[PDB]
Amino acid sequence: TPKPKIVLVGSGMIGGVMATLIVQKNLGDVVMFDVVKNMPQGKALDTSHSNVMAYSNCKVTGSNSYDDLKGADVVIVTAGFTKAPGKSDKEWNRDDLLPLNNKIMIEIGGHIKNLCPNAFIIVVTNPVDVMVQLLFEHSGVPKNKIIGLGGVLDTSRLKYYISQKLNVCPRDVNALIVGAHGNKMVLLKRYITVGGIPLQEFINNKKITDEEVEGIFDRTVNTALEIVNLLASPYVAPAAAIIEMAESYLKDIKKVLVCSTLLEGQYGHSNIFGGTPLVIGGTGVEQVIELQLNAEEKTKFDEAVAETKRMKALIHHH
Amino acid sequence: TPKPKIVLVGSGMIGGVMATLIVQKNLGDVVMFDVVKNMPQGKALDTSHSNVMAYSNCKVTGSNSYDDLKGADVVIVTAGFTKAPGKSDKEWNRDDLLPLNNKIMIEIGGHIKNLCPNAFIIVVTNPVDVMVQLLFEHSGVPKNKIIGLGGVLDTSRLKYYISQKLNVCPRDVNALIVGAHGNKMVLLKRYITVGGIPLQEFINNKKITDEEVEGIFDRTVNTALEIVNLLASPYVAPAAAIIEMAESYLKDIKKVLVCSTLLEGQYGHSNIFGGTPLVIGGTGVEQVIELQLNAEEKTKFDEAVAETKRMKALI
Amino acid sequence: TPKPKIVLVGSGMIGGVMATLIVQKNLGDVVMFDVVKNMPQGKALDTSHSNVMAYSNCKVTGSNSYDDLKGADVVIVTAGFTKAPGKSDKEWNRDDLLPLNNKIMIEIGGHIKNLCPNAFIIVVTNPVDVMVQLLFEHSGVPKNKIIGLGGVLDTSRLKYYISQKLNVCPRDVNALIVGAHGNKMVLLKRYITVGGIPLQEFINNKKITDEEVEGIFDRTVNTALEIVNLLASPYVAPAAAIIEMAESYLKDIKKVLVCSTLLEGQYGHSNIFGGTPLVIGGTGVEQVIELQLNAEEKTKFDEAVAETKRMKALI
Amino acid sequence: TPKPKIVLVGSGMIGGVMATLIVQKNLGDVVMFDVVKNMPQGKALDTSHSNVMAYSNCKVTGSNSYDDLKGADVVIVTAGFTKAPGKSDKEWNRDDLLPLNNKIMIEIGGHIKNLCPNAFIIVVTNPVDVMVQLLFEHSGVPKNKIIGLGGVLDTSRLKYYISQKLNVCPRDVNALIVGAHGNKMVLLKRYITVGGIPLQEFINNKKITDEEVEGIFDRTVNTALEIVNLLASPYVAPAAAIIEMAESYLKDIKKVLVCSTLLEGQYGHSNIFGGTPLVIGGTGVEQVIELQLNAEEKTKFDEAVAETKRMKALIH
Numbered sequence A: 001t002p003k004p005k006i007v008l009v010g011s012g013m014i015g016g017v018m019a020t021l022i023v024q025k026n027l028g029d030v031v032m033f034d035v036v037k038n039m040p041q042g043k044a045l046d047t048s049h050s051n052v053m054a055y056s057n058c059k060v061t062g063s064n065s066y067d068d069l070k071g072a073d074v075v076i077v078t079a080g081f082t083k084a085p086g087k088s089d090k091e092w093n094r095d096d097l098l099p100l101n102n103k104i105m106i107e108i109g110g111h112i113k114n115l116c117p118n119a120f121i122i123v124v125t126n127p128v129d130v131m132v133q134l135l136f137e138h139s140g141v142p143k144n145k146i147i148g149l150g151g152v153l154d155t156s157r158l159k160y161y162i163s164q165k166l167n168v169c170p171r172d173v174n175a176l177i178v179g180a181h182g183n184k185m186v187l188l189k190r191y192i193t194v195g196g197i198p199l200q201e202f203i204n205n206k207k208i209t210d211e212e213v214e215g216i217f218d219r220t221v222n223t224a225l226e227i228v229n230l231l232a233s234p235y236v237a238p239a240a241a242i243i244e245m246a247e248s249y250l251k252d253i254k255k256v257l258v259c260s261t262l263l264e265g266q267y268g269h270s271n272i273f274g275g276t277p278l279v280i281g282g283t284g285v286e287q288v289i290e291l292q293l294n295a296e297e298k299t300k301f302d303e304a305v306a307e308t309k310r311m312k313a314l315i316h317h318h
Numbered sequence B, C: 001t002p003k004p005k006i007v008l009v010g011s012g013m014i015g016g017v018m019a020t021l022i023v024q025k026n027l028g029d030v031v032m033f034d035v036v037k038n039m040p041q042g043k044a045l046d047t048s049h050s051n052v053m054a055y056s057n058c059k060v061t062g063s064n065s066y067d068d069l070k071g072a073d074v075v076i077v078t079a080g081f082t083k084a085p086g087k088s089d090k091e092w093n094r095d096d097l098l099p100l101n102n103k104i105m106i107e108i109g110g111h112i113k114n115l116c117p118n119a120f121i122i123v124v125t126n127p128v129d130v131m132v133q134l135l136f137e138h139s140g141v142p143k144n145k146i147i148g149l150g151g152v153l154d155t156s157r158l159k160y161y162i163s164q165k166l167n168v169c170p171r172d173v174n175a176l177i178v179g180a181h182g183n184k185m186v187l188l189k190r191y192i193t194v195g196g197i198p199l200q201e202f203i204n205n206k207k208i209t210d211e212e213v214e215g216i217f218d219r220t221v222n223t224a225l226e227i228v229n230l231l232a233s234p235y236v237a238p239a240a241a242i243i244e245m246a247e248s249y250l251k252d253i254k255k256v257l258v259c260s261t262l263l264e265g266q267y268g269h270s271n272i273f274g275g276t277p278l279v280i281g282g283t284g285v286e287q288v289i290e291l292q293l294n295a296e297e298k299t300k301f302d303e304a305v306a307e308t309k310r311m312k313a314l315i
Numbered sequence D: 001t002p003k004p005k006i007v008l009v010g011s012g013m014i015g016g017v018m019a020t021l022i023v024q025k026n027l028g029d030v031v032m033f034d035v036v037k038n039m040p041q042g043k044a045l046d047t048s049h050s051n052v053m054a055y056s057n058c059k060v061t062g063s064n065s066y067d068d069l070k071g072a073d074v075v076i077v078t079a080g081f082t083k084a085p086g087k088s089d090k091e092w093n094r095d096d097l098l099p100l101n102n103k104i105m106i107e108i109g110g111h112i113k114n115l116c117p118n119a120f121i122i123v124v125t126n127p128v129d130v131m132v133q134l135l136f137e138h139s140g141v142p143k144n145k146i147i148g149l150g151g152v153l154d155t156s157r158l159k160y161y162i163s164q165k166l167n168v169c170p171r172d173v174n175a176l177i178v179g180a181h182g183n184k185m186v187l188l189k190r191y192i193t194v195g196g197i198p199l200q201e202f203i204n205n206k207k208i209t210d211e212e213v214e215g216i217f218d219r220t221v222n223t224a225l226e227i228v229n230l231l232a233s234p235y236v237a238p239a240a241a242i243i244e245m246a247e248s249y250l251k252d253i254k255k256v257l258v259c260s261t262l263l264e265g266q267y268g269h270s271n272i273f274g275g276t277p278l279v280i281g282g283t284g285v286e287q288v289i290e291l292q293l294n295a296e297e298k299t300k301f302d303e304a305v306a307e308t309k310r311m312k313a314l315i316h
């Protein structure tokens, strides 16, 4: 009543798993949009069959037309990059791709503005804390209707690694990672709990050492790289985190989830997006929650936003 | 699987919800055991039809024979009672009845020893922190294989009430309530978090006041009375709490759940069952976690265990 | 809609399980409404705490005010008498409930028309095929927006008992029971399948006999009575069946489910509700499926509707 | 109690979705095994983080060692060969894959025999009805402990396409496709129901025509080619199907599922595996159900088996 419409702008690795998880959870009709011909149509056809196994009823269709954004309730943006003939088979980077992905966000933004200005938008394209603000600018949606992936995914690694050292259920570890997604993400040792108990109690109990925690911190920061070196850019956990955020919206669950949001003085920053706990409910972002960071913690946050500002200033670089 | 076998020793209000939820979750075959004849058979038949709607395949039968404890993987004991004849609801409490219930735990206990010595046991019969040690003594099961209901249920109320004031998902509130189930429950204000963030931060931000938090503490302690005075009794939340515990064992999830377990020097206490965070995994109680309480909190724990020692030395 | 609102008009046995199952499935905010004071508020408080165990976020409140109907997406009507005031168990006469529940339907119906004319309505109150038509008349809702419980629950017994004989998953048995809920329900032997395979194949292979099938038919007709004789009461499976219907609507699943619906010519009958397969999607009843019954099946359906007409005439 | 151990022998496209779904359902610990170095370890690490989102607790690890078969409750085999060299350019052959995949089955089977002889085994590697038998033969496992994927996936296509024409929930359509997986699959029009109701009633009510059903039948057979032509071999639905079968075993659900199993006289066939409805419960295959086919149906079933026999005979 009447079945949510979710459009995946970008139907690559992450898009594929998202469509799969949507059908599993019966969350809404799915449009798998991509600029690549035939590929989304093929994945959508395959995925549509799994409705039988799942006892679900979600239409899954593939598209190469922006017209299919019309009426979307949720839009998830993983579109970007690319690569070209050069110049391989690893020549890609980062800094150079900022003008390229800025231009994809402008194109997507104008189409959202015209075809689904009331959608809830989740941005994924890297660097996410930059790209989400770019989409916000060009789509014209309210600040409470657009967020970026980061904290849900980054904290899942930290939560996971601790739970395995302490031999508890992974979701029984709670942790906050703030500021930005990426190498300057702020891991807050102070805010780690295990079954609601401060982590420092398990350190005092010699269940885990401070050296073991810092080991886990660096592993968390470096997880993307670790997986890229075994395989490629991670996509199962990012999809799961994005679906957890979209479901909180679609089912009005009001989960506290760390995501990238427009900062309006929080942490002393403005005119910029960054990672902070927020509450996602049926109206979008319902609350932005500002952690009461000490001096030393605020310095780390400042560094994260500074890096986002650095990259944002490169969208017209040559 | 072999499909787990879950025996409900007691098929009253809580037994009914537990059978229903076991079927929803496809968790195992269910034996609804009661001393009352025909009633558990009748409930079992009704419940068994919900396998269709649930796409599950759990056998649900009723029994009046202890022999059906044979081969039980998990045994949940709610067999009692629930209030006092001659006693009303505006006085709702608990008394005497302690020796009659000890005699229940003796009889059940012998049967566990005989027919399902390897079962995981969850005790729900009140006073819970007393009744569990009793079944522990009489059944002879290892200490890592029997726990009592308290903290999952008590913290659920506190978590729930705080979540409604702060307008967040109920399970995004975490909280620890320890010592004993009942009026002496230790509500640890310092150990409450919201989305992983200390409660104190929302107090600082004036989203909730210190006086609303004390009002909610009070409401948690007195929830059962509040429900009873409203012409209902709590059984839906207690059943869900118990099934969360039971499922953590059967699926080896290793959730941190506050339950009543044998204290062996924790909190300065021994030869008594107290409520404390523990880890429930496929081998039973895998870890008993001892909170690092300050003296003001250790006094409140001392007192809750005091009241438990008072009711035990008395049967 | 982000958070559906589901109003349970009647918070007795079935209403209790319904609210429990809605929280389990996170399906919507729940209003437990009843004429009895305080009781639905006590139940609603207990049930609300289970949101924690379920990782759900559904408000569950109790109500004695029909104003709570405003905003309802789904209204489930279990409100009614189960026996006549003053009468004994021996003088039990099913026709006696007709004017008593009729008055209740009239009361509820005026409130629905005023406060939630666009809700989807599910009627459970017995005799259901009469009561649903009465509420349809008094509420003024469209024919695609109101249905009665019957075939989901009735086929669940048949499905279950067959599956237990053949040793398969209960949901892998498909069966249709049409016409009316009650002793005249039409058990359609020709339409039973097991894993999609005609039941005849399993009879031919001696996996089950024609006499076993007949005994299962008798068992299915007589289930409520069987359960009542055992000192209970069908409410778990009725609750599950109703939530399956309400969920197919709320999530636009378009499941094929046998429910009581307005007949406009189907089976040669008009101006009456009777059980037939139908599709429940986001807009309500999306299709009414008329079975191509043979001569003998049709006269069984005639006798079921005849009986519904007889009770309706009494009003 | 304790946690089931599920080893994915093959951590490719289907492998990855399987590990994802196992974690979503908290079904058991997963070993992602592959001959390709590092790749399954990368997928496993990524997949393990999803435990937090799923509220699950499944260890997910990657392996290039067969030793990890030790203690497996369920082994799912998607490991194989494909592609081709020199050849130019549309004439990939064949068929020539059969001996290379047989050598994979010999290798896998020897380790299962040594390290997990009591595992339940699900074979996916094509041609499935040939490969499952080869693995049965090389592993030594009991006949009730090994099946091949086919009908769960093949019927999901037919169920789904009919549900969309009739506008009902996909799972409310039931259908039986038997004999073999692949172009000779036997689609039984007579055994199609919709909400329990014979398909012919919808045809009579003009909600679908005989021609539409036949175009749907042809689409069902052409589905893997349709998707290969657009993308690659299908993997999401195949994984979902396989996890449905594995779950019925692990939770003793006793669902009726059409899978490839050893025929011992059913349908007039012996010494060969074929697609047929069967019951999967905690002991493995608990029942093999033989459909009472007519003469025309029995002859399509013979043509399916004869093609299985044909490919099996290319193995020396």
Ligand SMILES: CC(=O)C1=CN([C@@H]2O[C@H](COP(=O)(O)OP(=O)(O)OC[C@H]3O[C@@H](n4cnc5c(N)ncnc54)[C@H](O)[C@@H]3O)[C@@H](O)C2O)C=CC1
Binding pocket: A009, A010, A011, A012, A013, A014, A015, A033, A034, A035, A036, A078, A079, A080, A081, A082, A104, A107, A124, A125, A126, A128, A149, A150, A153, A181, A233, A234, A235, A238
């Ligand atoms: C924020 C965060 O935690 C993470 C972000 N990412 C990233 O999310 C993005 C997508 O990751 P995925 O692994 O799905 O990449 P992919 O290359 O498989 O998919 C991207 C797809 O977008 C298409 N695309 C390009 N331009 C498009 C456009 N204008 N519209 C739609 N699709 C487009 C392109 O064809 C490809 O299929 C990358 O930019 C990331 O770096 C990955 C992991 C975590």
Ligand SMILES: CC(=O)C1=CN([C@@H]2O[C@H](COP(=O)(O)OP(=O)(O)OC[C@H]3O[C@@H](n4cnc5c(N)ncnc54)[C@H](O)[C@@H]3O)[C@@H](O)C2O)C=CC1
Binding pocket: B009, B010, B011, B012, B013, B014, B015, B033, B034, B035, B036, B078, B079, B080, B081, B082, B104, B124, B125, B126, B128, B149, B150, B153, B181, B233, B234, B235, B238
């Ligand atoms: C620990 C905790 O947080 C809570 C504990 N309880 C309690 O759990 C018990 C059961 O509550 P319920 O609401 O289920 O009570 P009930 O009266 O509806 O059912 C108790 C059943 O036990 C049967 N019974 C009595 N003796 C028995 C025996 N020897 N063996 C099996 N069953 C027996 C008796 O016939 C009744 O059906 C009561 O003692 C409690 O105080 C309730 C809520 C919370």
Ligand SMILES: CC(=O)C1=CN([C@@H]2O[C@H](COP(=O)(O)OP(=O)(O)OC[C@H]3O[C@@H](n4cnc5c(N)ncnc54)[C@H](O)[C@@H]3O)[C@@H](O)[C@H]2O)C=CC1
Binding pocket: C009, C010, C011, C012, C013, C014, C015, C033, C034, C035, C036, C078, C079, C080, C081, C082, C104, C107, C123, C124, C125, C126, C128, C149, C150, C153, C181, C234, C235, C238
């Ligand atoms: C159709 C079908 O398959 C089935 C129908 N039923 C029935 O569904 C109804 C409810 O069954 P339940 O076992 O829940 O009955 P209950 O007495 O426990 O609950 C009925 C509640 O309705 C209230 N009620 C009475 N009048 C009311 C009014 N005017 N407004 C609101 N609530 C009212 C009354 O106070 C009680 O709590 C009865 O009419 C049935 O015969 C039961 C099984 C199956």
Ligand SMILES: CC(=O)C1=CN([C@@H]2O[C@H](COP(=O)(O)OP(=O)(O)OC[C@H]3O[C@@H](n4cnc5c(N)ncnc54)[C@H](O)[C@@H]3O)[C@@H](O)[C@H]2O)C=CC1
Binding pocket: D009, D010, D011, D012, D013, D014, D015, D033, D034, D035, D036, D078, D079, D080, D081, D104, D107, D124, D125, D126, D128, D149, D150, D153, D181, D233, D234, D235, D238
């Ligand atoms: C029966 C049925 O309905 C279907 C069967 N299939 C097939 O299932 C197989 C795998 O499909 P997927 O899409 O997963 O292919 P992939 O190439 O991505 O994965 C194959 C993996 O196996 C590895 N592999 C090769 N030899 C191995 C060995 N000895 N041990 C373990 N892994 C091995 C190889 O490295 C690759 O990752 C192919 O043979 C199929 O034709 C597909 C769809 C349906």
